[PDB]
Amino acid sequence: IEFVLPSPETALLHVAGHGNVEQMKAQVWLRALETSVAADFYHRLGPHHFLLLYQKKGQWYEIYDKYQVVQTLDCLRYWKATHRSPGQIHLVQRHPPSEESQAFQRQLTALIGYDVTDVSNVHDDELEFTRRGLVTPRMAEVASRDPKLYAMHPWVTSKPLPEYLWKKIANNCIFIVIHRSTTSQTIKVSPDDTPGAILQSFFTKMEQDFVLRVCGRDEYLVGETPIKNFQWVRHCLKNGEEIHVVLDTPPDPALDEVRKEEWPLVDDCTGVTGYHEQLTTVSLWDCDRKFRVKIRGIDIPVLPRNTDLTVFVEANIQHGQQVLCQRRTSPKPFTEEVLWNVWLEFSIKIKDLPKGALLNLQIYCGQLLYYVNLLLIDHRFLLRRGEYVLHMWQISFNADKLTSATNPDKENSMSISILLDNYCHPIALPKHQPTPDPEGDRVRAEMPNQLRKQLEAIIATDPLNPLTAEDKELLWHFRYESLKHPKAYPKLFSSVKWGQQEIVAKTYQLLARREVWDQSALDVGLTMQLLDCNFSDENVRAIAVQKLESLEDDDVLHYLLQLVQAVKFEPYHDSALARFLLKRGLRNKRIGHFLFWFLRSEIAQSRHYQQRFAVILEAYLRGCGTAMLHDFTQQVQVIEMLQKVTLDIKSLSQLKQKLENLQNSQLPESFRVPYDPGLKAGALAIEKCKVMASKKKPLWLEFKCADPTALSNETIGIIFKHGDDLRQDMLILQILRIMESIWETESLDLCLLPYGCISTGDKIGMIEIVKDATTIAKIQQSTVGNTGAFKDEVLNHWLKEKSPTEEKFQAAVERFVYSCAGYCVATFVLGIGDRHNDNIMITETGNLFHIDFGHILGNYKSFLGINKERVPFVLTPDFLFVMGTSGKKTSPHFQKFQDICVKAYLALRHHTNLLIILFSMMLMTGMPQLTSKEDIEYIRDALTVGKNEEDAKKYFLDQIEVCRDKGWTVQFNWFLHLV
Amino acid sequence: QVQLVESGGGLVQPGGSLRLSCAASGSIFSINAMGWYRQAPGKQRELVAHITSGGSTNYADSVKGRFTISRDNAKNTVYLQMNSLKPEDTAVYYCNEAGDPFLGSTWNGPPAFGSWGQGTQVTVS
């Protein structure tokens, strides 16, 4: 193999096989030193190590591996494919990064809030290798990037227009107002016309390099799509407002420039692992010995006083929340340092260990106190060996219990010392599957009719339905028949015995011939099921991601937070879901913005997955252009300074002085709103800001709009609060939006509107202010409710006062009925229906809201209200009096409310499966505490799984009746508890 | 293998009506949403009518108010009822397993199925 030394010297080496030939660094070093006195001189001045580069596709690649030459099989395969026997490898000096690179890295660190280059809490190079490996998708997305559409990021959907919106088009025409300087002209256009056609019509109705931008917002109506397919156009149609656009010059694509990538490409880590024949290094499948681990001891500087006098260690081998084997140590007195030095031998073979298996070490007292996880197979298909001293996590099913990260608090957490068996040669797990040539003896005989019926019934069941041993055996024995039905994939793969190598090989053969799945229609619930905690195998995840790859940008935006949370379920840092999220955030600007904020919140608040999300955020930030970087920097600056001011105020006219200090110093002239990238906030209306009379003391801030083209002088309401976790609020609001879309596809407009919520840091966040909205508790306290006495006419009189005319009042009543029904159904399904008046808001137009979901979500998870009087949802006598005449018999408005809520309940029951998987993900990810069964099953009990539509309708009517039974009792109890 | 056979098409005058039927050979028909696709001459195939396993119906904008889709899980057959036919409705109509109604990717373009049947020809003239 030809080598180029750094003096363009060409030294001809030879192919030295693949057995421990990574000493080629030393071999070439010695060859250069002997063949050149200059190399001998530079040996005293050169860096510690050098690099290997070659030409894959014109771009420089790097051999980033110091273990074996079998990893370098990719460059050899490329060289043979190109038919170039003498291969060229260049050595490059390990140049330190330049000052500009260091400054860019510091800027990225400031944006992320976590130091990705720190290696003080890692025992391997998985995160660094993930950083090196995320370059190729980033460069692929940057290369295949259309500059104009990326700069302008049109927001379009391909769904048909809703019936209530399709009817709203008066005469199959849409009025658009185009503003040019001070001139305003209204043009009538058909809903099936592209914006280019509208622009051409406007120009003919008197240069051509112009576009339509929404007045007062950073949204462009461009691209080749009908005007009715724009999300802002649909938003304006739904609200009945006029569509105002301005003729603006297109934004410069040069502002989205991305600086050149500084690292060479890293290839893949699958080179080290080959087929079973190639690896029989030592093949993992050759070792038939049982797995064994030594628990050396337990160390803790300060003993907790929670529980003592007895302690032991439990070692579990699990693959996707299924414990393959379980071993325990002899209990010992609970003191500062406990010593065992005992080998725990499991009944599972070493060859049968599946990739993604987790060694779960837990400390029990006498109940579970500390836990820590260790991935048995590392990212490079190698079994873990040697000493490991892991700092454990302290508990205060959960996604936090699956993390392979170590506790960063080295000086205060409990530490466990373990030992794993060592070997002379590294043990490498062979490749997943060479080829499905034998077909694994696919079944030929047709299933008996009764067995076919049993299999169909098993497939038709809900995701939460447990599978018996007979059910699993039937699913596996007829796997090739179950492939024809994509709905059976989660159940088919739940019946796989992952603790046997041969069964895993059969499963890999089975999924190597997936065609019915490939052409199958994209089902969101099924794919999210395949990404849950119950699937730790990489190939099932890849299948789910490749199905997700056919989504559109709006569809991804609907489920972006859920996928970000599901990244936690990935056993390894460099997963297909991470690549998919990075690619879709680099493709679209809105997706990138929301992904940045969602990921930064998790970095700030979740220590278990800080490093992985930090690496993903680094990849995205390097991918995006400099305009996005500047906007992110401005947003982070304003967020940090508002956080500091919130801290100072919470420590205690002072707010006015501090806001004046901010406005004249370091406050950016304009910043993008984190929960609405299309809106830019400018100066701060200090004379309107205040501090609300709440226990958390949030900041009521109002910013002026930074766009001069805005049609209104209305400010931008922003609430900054500290001491509450807004992540649960974001999850609840996202699920509300998903249910709103589900109702939309069934011609149901429940008037349920979620507000803007973004968590910006540790227990801080930003809340959108809904204008002209007040709280039901305040409405009561205006007349009666300060002392606890309650009246029914207060809400009706308040709505009557805010309505100038009778038609406005009737519209307000209709909106109140629809919003109340929608929120009742949504909160009953989600289990957050038992709230107090202080967390329910209402506008002057009648719309109803539920706020502060984090306050009630944790309380309901901890208590479930089984020890109190729980109501399914807030159907308060004031609501009934607003709806009907409160005659306790019926009313046309009450009948309409009952009908629409039953319709919404049946609509949600139509997508029970997706709702169930969303609820499960929400519980296991968004809950700081530990959940289990009987809590996940709440949704399948509330969604009335396995019952008729009439039975479900009767059940929901019974829930309404029991709400009507307890009129003021629950509200009075809440008042007494709070007071 | 899932097999679908479409029937009911033919020549009809403008303003007329037609009723298509299609029988599916998939025995899990009960839990699968189905939809009707049409391929205009020199045009890509597009979903026009969507029905869920429960029975909720969603239609494309062009065919809204004139097309009605129904299913019978007992006979594993899906019916599409056309009213007030217009010349642009002339296309080859197909039925298959549709997708998610609220997903925009389903309404986007060809759903990349590999089990398309023969279809039926509808001509309005």
Numbering used by the authors:
A (entry chain A): 40 to 45, 53 to 252, 267 to 340, 351 to 436, 459 to 488, 497 to 752, 765 to 1091
B (entry chain B): 1 to 125
Paper text:
A set of helices positioned C-terminal to the activation loop in the kinase domain play a critical role in regulating activity, with this region referred to as the regulatory motif. The p110γ isoform is unique in that it is inhibited in the absence of a regulatory subunit, with this driven by an autoinhibitory conformation of the regulatory motif, that is proposed to require membrane association to disrupt.
We characterized an allosteric inhibitory nanobody (NB7) that potently inhibits p110γ activity. Using this sample, we obtained a cryo-EM reconstruction of the complex of nanobody (NB7)-bound p110γ at 3.0 Å overall resolution from 149,603 particles. The interface between NB7 and p110γ was extensive, with ~1200 Å of buried surface area, with interactions of the ABD-RBD linker, N-terminus of the helical domain, and the regulatory motif at the turn between k8 and k9 (1022-1026aa). A pocket formed between the helical domain and the ABD-RBD linker forms the majority of the interface, with extensive interactions with the long CDR3. The CDR1 loop packed up against the N-terminal section of the helical domain, with the CDR2 loop forming the interface with the regulatory motif. Therefore, rigidifying the regulatory motif likely explains the molecular basis for how it prevents kinase activity.
